[PDB]
mmCIF file of C-alpha atoms and ligand atoms in Angstrom:
data_model
loop_
_atom_site.group_PDB
_atom_site.id
_atom_site.type_symbol
_atom_site.label_atom_id
_atom_site.label_comp_id
_atom_site.label_asym_id
_atom_site.label_seq_id
_atom_site.Cartn_x
_atom_site.Cartn_y
_atom_site.Cartn_z
ATOM 1 C CA UNK J 1 32.126 -24.653 -21.784
ATOM 2 C CA UNK J 2 30.920 -25.790 -25.239
ATOM 3 C CA UNK J 3 31.811 -25.928 -28.934
ATOM 4 C CA UNK J 4 29.693 -24.303 -31.668
ATOM 5 C CA UNK J 5 28.857 -26.624 -34.571
ATOM 6 C CA UNK J 6 26.724 -24.204 -36.580
ATOM 7 C CA UNK J 7 23.826 -21.791 -36.467
ATOM 8 C CA UNK J 8 20.480 -23.542 -36.835
ATOM 9 C CA UNK J 9 18.625 -20.273 -37.360
ATOM 10 C CA UNK J 10 17.375 -17.049 -35.791
ATOM 11 C CA UNK J 11 14.198 -16.828 -33.708
ATOM 12 C CA UNK J 12 12.398 -13.717 -32.457
ATOM 13 C CA UNK J 13 14.321 -14.058 -29.171
ATOM 14 C CA UNK J 14 17.701 -14.231 -30.883
ATOM 15 C CA UNK J 15 20.000 -16.759 -32.532
ATOM 16 C CA UNK J 16 19.943 -20.520 -31.849
ATOM 17 C CA UNK J 17 23.080 -22.601 -32.401
ATOM 18 C CA UNK J 18 23.751 -26.328 -32.405
ATOM 19 C CA UNK J 19 26.539 -26.942 -29.878
ATOM 20 C CA UNK J 20 28.492 -29.849 -28.397
ATOM 21 C CA UNK J 21 29.762 -30.402 -24.843
ATOM 22 C CA UNK J 22 30.414 -34.912 -26.593
ATOM 23 C CA UNK J 23 26.752 -34.283 -25.792
ATOM 24 C CA UNK J 24 24.861 -32.435 -28.528
ATOM 25 C CA UNK J 25 22.752 -29.505 -27.328
ATOM 26 C CA UNK J 26 21.601 -26.073 -28.434
ATOM 27 C CA UNK J 27 21.852 -22.702 -26.807
ATOM 28 C CA UNK J 28 19.573 -19.694 -27.180
ATOM 29 C CA UNK J 29 21.456 -16.395 -27.422
ATOM 30 C CA UNK J 30 19.598 -13.763 -25.419
ATOM 31 C CA UNK J 31 21.294 -10.392 -25.885
ATOM 32 C CA UNK J 32 20.763 -8.185 -22.817
ATOM 33 C CA UNK J 33 23.071 -5.455 -24.071
ATOM 34 C CA UNK J 34 20.564 -2.850 -25.217
ATOM 35 C CA UNK J 35 18.531 -3.309 -22.048
ATOM 36 C CA UNK J 36 18.143 -0.991 -19.081
ATOM 37 C CA UNK J 37 18.704 -2.309 -15.559
ATOM 38 C CA UNK J 38 14.923 -2.754 -15.282
ATOM 39 C CA UNK J 39 14.552 -4.666 -18.567
ATOM 40 C CA UNK J 40 17.467 -6.980 -17.717
ATOM 41 C CA UNK J 41 15.733 -7.702 -14.395
ATOM 42 C CA UNK J 42 12.531 -8.740 -16.174
ATOM 43 C CA UNK J 43 14.578 -11.016 -18.446
ATOM 44 C CA UNK J 44 16.150 -12.730 -15.443
ATOM 45 C CA UNK J 45 12.693 -13.244 -13.950
ATOM 46 C CA UNK J 46 11.218 -14.845 -17.071
ATOM 47 C CA UNK J 47 14.226 -17.053 -17.668
ATOM 48 C CA UNK J 48 14.194 -18.144 -14.019
ATOM 49 C CA UNK J 49 10.483 -18.942 -14.340
ATOM 50 C CA UNK J 50 10.889 -20.983 -17.521
ATOM 51 C CA UNK J 51 14.053 -22.668 -16.157
ATOM 52 C CA UNK J 52 11.960 -24.533 -13.568
ATOM 53 C CA UNK J 53 9.718 -26.373 -16.045
ATOM 54 C CA UNK J 54 10.458 -30.092 -16.224
ATOM 55 C CA UNK J 55 8.531 -32.553 -18.379
ATOM 56 C CA UNK J 56 9.326 -35.303 -20.916
ATOM 57 C CA UNK J 57 7.387 -33.306 -23.527
ATOM 58 C CA UNK J 58 8.949 -29.920 -22.768
ATOM 59 C CA UNK J 59 12.387 -29.044 -24.186
ATOM 60 C CA UNK J 60 14.731 -29.695 -21.262
ATOM 61 C CA UNK J 61 16.684 -26.848 -19.663
ATOM 62 C CA UNK J 62 20.293 -27.728 -18.935
ATOM 63 C CA UNK J 63 22.284 -24.657 -17.998
ATOM 64 C CA UNK J 64 22.817 -20.932 -18.382
ATOM 65 C CA UNK J 65 25.961 -19.090 -19.408
ATOM 66 C CA UNK J 66 26.443 -15.431 -18.548
ATOM 67 C CA UNK J 67 28.892 -13.992 -21.059
ATOM 68 C CA UNK J 68 29.619 -10.436 -20.010
ATOM 69 C CA UNK J 69 31.991 -9.678 -22.896
ATOM 70 C CA UNK J 70 29.261 -10.614 -25.416
ATOM 71 C CA UNK J 71 26.579 -9.114 -23.250
ATOM 72 C CA UNK J 72 24.679 -12.352 -23.827
ATOM 73 C CA UNK J 73 22.812 -14.882 -21.754
ATOM 74 C CA UNK J 74 23.246 -18.311 -23.376
ATOM 75 C CA UNK J 75 20.471 -20.726 -22.450
ATOM 76 C CA UNK J 76 21.636 -24.307 -22.956
ATOM 77 C CA UNK J 77 18.877 -26.740 -23.885
ATOM 78 C CA UNK J 78 17.995 -30.144 -25.258
ATOM 79 C CA UNK J 79 18.670 -30.651 -28.965
ATOM 80 C CA UNK J 80 15.711 -32.225 -30.762
ATOM 81 C CA UNK J 81 16.975 -34.495 -33.523
ATOM 82 C CA UNK J 82 13.605 -34.788 -35.285
ATOM 83 C CA UNK J 83 13.232 -31.104 -36.200
ATOM 84 C CA UNK J 84 9.929 -29.217 -35.880
ATOM 85 C CA UNK J 85 6.259 -30.072 -36.532
ATOM 86 C CA UNK J 86 6.127 -27.412 -39.259
ATOM 87 C CA UNK J 87 8.364 -29.558 -41.474
ATOM 88 C CA UNK J 88 6.168 -32.601 -40.866
ATOM 89 C CA UNK J 89 3.213 -30.574 -42.126
ATOM 90 C CA UNK J 90 5.042 -29.322 -45.231
ATOM 91 C CA UNK J 91 6.202 -32.917 -45.834
ATOM 92 C CA UNK J 92 2.609 -34.185 -45.770
ATOM 93 C CA UNK J 93 1.628 -31.511 -48.269
ATOM 94 C CA UNK J 94 4.465 -32.439 -50.638
ATOM 95 C CA UNK J 95 3.790 -36.185 -50.422
ATOM 96 C CA UNK J 96 0.015 -35.695 -50.619
ATOM 97 C CA UNK J 97 -0.254 -37.890 -47.531
ATOM 98 C CA UNK J 98 -2.350 -36.911 -44.515
ATOM 99 C CA UNK J 99 -0.935 -37.833 -41.094
ATOM 100 C CA UNK J 100 -2.382 -40.976 -39.494
ATOM 101 C CA UNK J 101 -4.999 -40.306 -36.790
ATOM 102 C CA UNK J 102 -2.753 -42.223 -34.376
ATOM 103 C CA UNK J 103 0.068 -39.726 -34.868
ATOM 104 C CA UNK J 104 -2.302 -36.774 -34.443
ATOM 105 C CA UNK J 105 -3.566 -38.280 -31.176
ATOM 106 C CA UNK J 106 0.022 -38.650 -29.934
ATOM 107 C CA UNK J 107 0.747 -35.016 -30.704
ATOM 108 C CA UNK J 108 -2.493 -33.822 -29.089
ATOM 109 C CA UNK J 109 -1.896 -35.968 -26.015
ATOM 110 C CA UNK J 110 1.781 -34.991 -25.504
ATOM 111 C CA UNK J 111 1.294 -31.269 -26.174
ATOM 112 C CA UNK J 112 -1.627 -31.260 -23.771
ATOM 113 C CA UNK J 113 0.524 -32.960 -21.110
ATOM 114 C CA UNK J 114 3.236 -30.336 -21.705
ATOM 115 C CA UNK J 115 0.714 -27.489 -21.340
ATOM 116 C CA UNK J 116 -0.776 -29.220 -18.304
ATOM 117 C CA UNK J 117 2.588 -28.966 -16.542
ATOM 118 C CA UNK J 118 2.657 -25.257 -17.460
ATOM 119 C CA UNK J 119 -0.962 -24.391 -16.566
ATOM 120 C CA UNK J 120 -1.006 -26.761 -13.550
ATOM 121 C CA UNK J 121 2.526 -26.847 -12.088
ATOM 122 C CA UNK J 122 3.308 -30.262 -10.550
ATOM 123 C CA UNK J 123 5.725 -28.653 -8.108
ATOM 124 C CA UNK J 124 3.871 -25.812 -6.443
ATOM 125 C CA UNK J 125 5.331 -23.348 -8.953
ATOM 126 C CA UNK J 126 4.026 -20.246 -10.706
ATOM 127 C CA UNK J 127 1.682 -20.855 -13.677
ATOM 128 C CA UNK J 128 3.222 -20.321 -17.099
ATOM 129 C CA UNK J 129 1.486 -19.815 -20.426
ATOM 130 C CA UNK J 130 3.342 -20.745 -23.596
ATOM 131 C CA UNK J 131 2.181 -17.678 -25.593
ATOM 132 C CA UNK J 132 3.731 -18.738 -28.926
ATOM 133 C CA UNK J 133 2.255 -22.147 -29.644
ATOM 134 C CA UNK J 134 2.664 -22.974 -33.348
ATOM 135 C CA UNK J 135 4.180 -25.865 -35.361
ATOM 136 C CA UNK J 136 7.579 -24.106 -35.546
ATOM 137 C CA UNK J 137 7.805 -24.163 -31.719
ATOM 138 C CA UNK J 138 6.981 -27.833 -31.435
ATOM 139 C CA UNK J 139 10.090 -29.958 -31.742
ATOM 140 C CA UNK J 140 10.509 -33.717 -32.148
ATOM 141 C CA UNK J 141 13.012 -36.167 -30.691
ATOM 142 C CA UNK J 142 14.422 -39.182 -32.520
ATOM 143 C CA UNK J 143 11.235 -41.195 -31.956
ATOM 144 C CA UNK J 144 9.065 -38.238 -32.950
ATOM 145 C CA UNK J 145 7.942 -37.596 -29.398
ATOM 146 C CA UNK J 146 6.768 -34.019 -28.851
ATOM 147 C CA UNK J 147 9.099 -31.489 -27.237
ATOM 148 C CA UNK J 148 7.387 -28.126 -26.698
ATOM 149 C CA UNK J 149 9.897 -25.293 -26.773
ATOM 150 C CA UNK J 150 10.692 -21.670 -27.522
ATOM 151 C CA UNK J 151 8.318 -20.260 -24.923
ATOM 152 C CA UNK J 152 7.025 -16.782 -25.756
ATOM 153 C CA UNK J 153 9.035 -14.091 -23.973
ATOM 154 C CA UNK J 154 0.757 -12.638 -41.158
ATOM 155 C CA UNK J 155 -2.643 -13.778 -42.352
ATOM 156 C CA UNK J 156 -2.505 -16.685 -39.894
ATOM 157 C CA UNK J 157 -4.784 -17.526 -36.900
ATOM 158 C CA UNK J 158 -1.815 -18.237 -34.626
ATOM 159 C CA UNK J 159 -1.283 -14.508 -34.171
ATOM 160 C CA UNK J 160 -4.942 -13.706 -33.719
ATOM 161 C CA UNK J 161 -6.719 -15.372 -30.791
ATOM 162 C CA UNK J 162 -10.253 -14.069 -30.096
ATOM 163 C CA UNK J 163 -8.797 -12.687 -26.824
ATOM 164 C CA UNK J 164 -6.463 -10.445 -28.792
ATOM 165 C CA UNK J 165 -9.366 -9.444 -31.044
ATOM 166 C CA UNK J 166 -11.444 -8.501 -28.009
ATOM 167 C CA UNK J 167 -8.723 -6.761 -26.007
ATOM 168 C CA UNK J 168 -8.627 -9.314 -23.233
ATOM 169 C CA UNK J 169 -5.503 -10.692 -21.623
ATOM 170 C CA UNK J 170 -3.893 -13.832 -23.017
ATOM 171 C CA UNK J 171 -5.008 -16.686 -20.768
ATOM 172 C CA UNK J 172 -4.786 -20.478 -20.542
ATOM 173 C CA UNK J 173 -7.670 -20.824 -23.019
ATOM 174 C CA UNK J 174 -5.667 -18.660 -25.441
ATOM 175 C CA UNK J 175 -3.039 -21.460 -25.352
ATOM 176 C CA UNK J 176 -5.870 -23.927 -26.066
ATOM 177 C CA UNK J 177 -7.010 -21.869 -29.087
ATOM 178 C CA UNK J 178 -3.476 -22.074 -30.499
ATOM 179 C CA UNK J 179 -3.411 -25.811 -29.793
ATOM 180 C CA UNK J 180 -6.658 -26.073 -31.767
ATOM 181 C CA UNK J 181 -5.121 -24.163 -34.688
ATOM 182 C CA UNK J 182 -2.027 -26.361 -34.579
ATOM 183 C CA UNK J 183 -3.890 -29.682 -34.441
ATOM 184 C CA UNK J 184 -6.307 -28.496 -37.120
ATOM 185 C CA UNK J 185 -3.331 -27.658 -39.316
ATOM 186 C CA UNK J 186 -1.715 -31.038 -38.603
ATOM 187 C CA UNK J 187 -4.911 -32.785 -39.881
ATOM 188 C CA UNK J 188 -5.894 -30.565 -42.803
ATOM 189 C CA UNK J 189 -2.353 -29.493 -43.780
ATOM 190 C CA UNK J 190 -3.672 -25.932 -43.707
ATOM 191 C CA UNK J 191 -4.715 -23.566 -40.889
ATOM 192 C CA UNK J 192 -8.450 -23.222 -40.146
ATOM 193 C CA UNK J 193 -8.623 -19.540 -41.159
ATOM 194 C CA UNK J 194 -6.694 -18.192 -44.136
ATOM 195 C CA UNK J 195 -6.505 -14.637 -45.483
ATOM 196 C CA UNK J 196 -4.315 -12.046 -47.232
ATOM 197 C CA UNK J 197 -4.705 -9.354 -44.556
ATOM 198 C CA UNK J 198 -5.382 -9.081 -40.812
ATOM 199 C CA UNK J 199 -8.744 -7.454 -41.565
ATOM 200 C CA UNK J 200 -9.902 -10.297 -43.799
ATOM 201 C CA UNK J 201 -8.517 -12.783 -41.260
ATOM 202 C CA UNK J 202 -10.353 -11.060 -38.389
ATOM 203 C CA UNK J 203 -13.536 -11.274 -40.433
ATOM 204 C CA UNK J 204 -13.128 -15.017 -40.959
ATOM 205 C CA UNK J 205 -12.375 -15.695 -37.303
ATOM 206 C CA UNK J 206 -15.259 -13.492 -36.147
ATOM 207 C CA UNK J 207 -17.578 -15.705 -38.182
ATOM 208 C CA UNK J 208 -15.955 -18.692 -36.409
ATOM 209 C CA UNK J 209 -16.458 -20.925 -39.467
ATOM 210 C CA UNK J 210 -14.007 -23.335 -41.137
ATOM 211 C CA UNK J 211 -14.061 -26.657 -43.029
ATOM 212 C CA UNK J 212 -14.310 -29.975 -41.184
ATOM 213 C CA UNK J 213 -10.946 -31.684 -40.862
ATOM 214 C CA UNK J 214 -10.549 -34.425 -43.531
ATOM 215 C CA UNK J 215 -12.945 -37.383 -43.374
ATOM 216 C CA UNK J 216 -9.859 -39.521 -42.734
ATOM 217 C CA UNK J 217 -10.365 -38.384 -39.138
ATOM 218 C CA UNK J 218 -13.010 -39.632 -36.716
ATOM 219 C CA UNK J 219 -15.970 -37.485 -35.687
ATOM 220 C CA UNK J 220 -14.587 -37.566 -32.136
ATOM 221 C CA UNK J 221 -11.231 -36.014 -33.129
ATOM 222 C CA UNK J 222 -12.934 -33.386 -35.276
ATOM 223 C CA UNK J 223 -15.155 -32.468 -32.374
ATOM 224 C CA UNK J 224 -12.400 -31.978 -29.765
ATOM 225 C CA UNK J 225 -10.266 -29.869 -32.170
ATOM 226 C CA UNK J 226 -13.381 -27.824 -33.093
ATOM 227 C CA UNK J 227 -14.086 -27.325 -29.402
ATOM 228 C CA UNK J 228 -10.661 -25.732 -28.938
ATOM 229 C CA UNK J 229 -11.639 -23.281 -31.701
ATOM 230 C CA UNK J 230 -14.750 -21.951 -29.953
ATOM 231 C CA UNK J 231 -14.855 -18.127 -30.018
ATOM 232 C CA UNK J 232 -15.771 -17.962 -26.314
ATOM 233 C CA UNK J 233 -12.775 -18.975 -24.183
ATOM 234 C CA UNK J 234 -15.095 -20.553 -21.578
ATOM 235 C CA UNK J 235 -16.411 -22.895 -24.280
ATOM 236 C CA UNK J 236 -12.890 -24.232 -24.948
ATOM 237 C CA UNK J 237 -11.795 -27.312 -22.979
ATOM 238 C CA UNK J 238 -9.116 -27.060 -20.265
ATOM 239 C CA UNK J 239 -6.140 -29.409 -20.486
ATOM 240 C CA UNK J 240 -7.985 -31.738 -18.069
ATOM 241 C CA UNK J 241 -11.078 -31.891 -20.266
ATOM 242 C CA UNK J 242 -8.947 -32.625 -23.334
ATOM 243 C CA UNK J 243 -7.119 -35.501 -21.573
ATOM 244 C CA UNK J 244 -10.478 -36.948 -20.421
ATOM 245 C CA UNK J 245 -11.432 -37.540 -24.055
ATOM 246 C CA UNK J 246 -12.141 -41.235 -24.870
ATOM 247 C CA UNK J 247 -9.781 -41.097 -27.881
ATOM 248 C CA UNK J 248 -6.731 -40.571 -25.697
ATOM 249 C CA UNK J 249 -5.197 -43.858 -24.566
ATOM 250 C CA UNK J 250 -2.057 -44.958 -22.673
ATOM 251 C CA UNK J 251 0.049 -45.598 -25.779
ATOM 252 C CA UNK J 252 -0.561 -42.043 -27.043
ATOM 253 C CA UNK J 253 1.583 -40.824 -24.100
ATOM 254 C CA UNK J 254 4.953 -42.008 -25.507
ATOM 255 C CA UNK J 255 6.212 -43.648 -28.716
HETATM 256 C C1 7GJ Q 301 14.274 -25.069 -38.777
HETATM 257 N N1 7GJ Q 301 14.503 -26.216 -37.927
HETATM 258 C C2 7GJ Q 301 13.476 -26.609 -36.986
HETATM 259 C C3 7GJ Q 301 15.755 -26.948 -38.060
HETATM 260 O O1 7GJ Q 301 16.571 -26.566 -38.879
HETATM 261 C C4 7GJ Q 301 16.123 -28.198 -37.220
HETATM 262 C C5 7GJ Q 301 16.444 -29.379 -37.895
HETATM 263 C C6 7GJ Q 301 16.804 -30.522 -37.168
HETATM 264 C C7 7GJ Q 301 16.835 -30.485 -35.767
HETATM 265 C C8 7GJ Q 301 16.523 -29.302 -35.086
HETATM 266 N N2 7GJ Q 301 16.583 -29.331 -33.643
HETATM 267 C C9 7GJ Q 301 16.267 -28.274 -32.736
HETATM 268 N N3 7GJ Q 301 15.996 -27.037 -33.146
HETATM 269 C C10 7GJ Q 301 15.693 -26.051 -32.259
HETATM 270 O O2 7GJ Q 301 15.389 -24.715 -32.684
HETATM 271 C C11 7GJ Q 301 15.328 -24.583 -34.179
HETATM 272 C C12 7GJ Q 301 15.544 -23.138 -34.582
HETATM 273 C C13 7GJ Q 301 14.878 -22.210 -33.563
HETATM 274 C C14 7GJ Q 301 14.845 -20.664 -34.094
HETATM 275 C C15 7GJ Q 301 14.025 -20.562 -35.443
HETATM 276 C C16 7GJ Q 301 14.705 -21.406 -36.526
HETATM 277 C C17 7GJ Q 301 14.978 -22.951 -36.052
HETATM 278 C C18 7GJ Q 301 15.685 -26.355 -30.896
HETATM 279 N N4 7GJ Q 301 15.434 -25.613 -29.772
HETATM 280 C C19 7GJ Q 301 15.568 -26.401 -28.719
HETATM 281 N N5 7GJ Q 301 15.887 -27.630 -29.131
HETATM 282 C C20 7GJ Q 301 15.980 -27.649 -30.493
HETATM 283 N N6 7GJ Q 301 16.272 -28.575 -31.468
HETATM 284 C C21 7GJ Q 301 16.176 -28.153 -35.817
#
């Protein structure tokens, strides 16, 4: 059993609390109480799927607690001392300091490794797609290594992939599109498409145009991020094609 320190916040899946076993962790509070037998069964399936993922750049699963009185499944996971990537981005904006290209390459490399484990399971395993890849779902450890978490169970691109816009199923290249949006935003300190309404946003995406990332950043880094933002999913690189990029070196794999 564990002790609750405080509530960190509330995600779309439910509340997340900082807890202590004296190992510091978090749990995600998944309330199955309004669910039918069928819906609860789906929940079990997804949680069992996600439970299997293991990777140094994926938030580590630790345990599950079934609390029948509270009608709640508590999913115990790694606490990430460094916070989220969103706060890094807002920090850069406030300080008027762009992130170093080296740090961007570390984030791109580690997130792509994380997604590689999902898209290409190292252990046989059923493929998983993240489905909610945005700076708020990317956490950081004490050394600011990437820990991808909060797997998916506005006038912002993150909630409009071209697959959504075209009524086609979310696929692995839809994850890559979101990765492109995220890395773009890390470099420019703003998303590649901005708008006041979904309609205006859809218009901007459909044109597929956006500013170059800042000239701080090499042509090679601009090109691979841009490639992830191709309108056609088959023009976007797979995780293997990303990792083959000449920019990505051994030391980008862990800091
Ligand atoms: C808003 N935010 C990221 C924080 O307050 C914060 C600050 C320092 C360390 C952490 N550390 C952390 N935060 C998490 O989820 C954050 C929570 C999720 C629901 C939406 C609001 C914010 C974690 N999930 C798994 N491991 C985690 N480690 C979070």
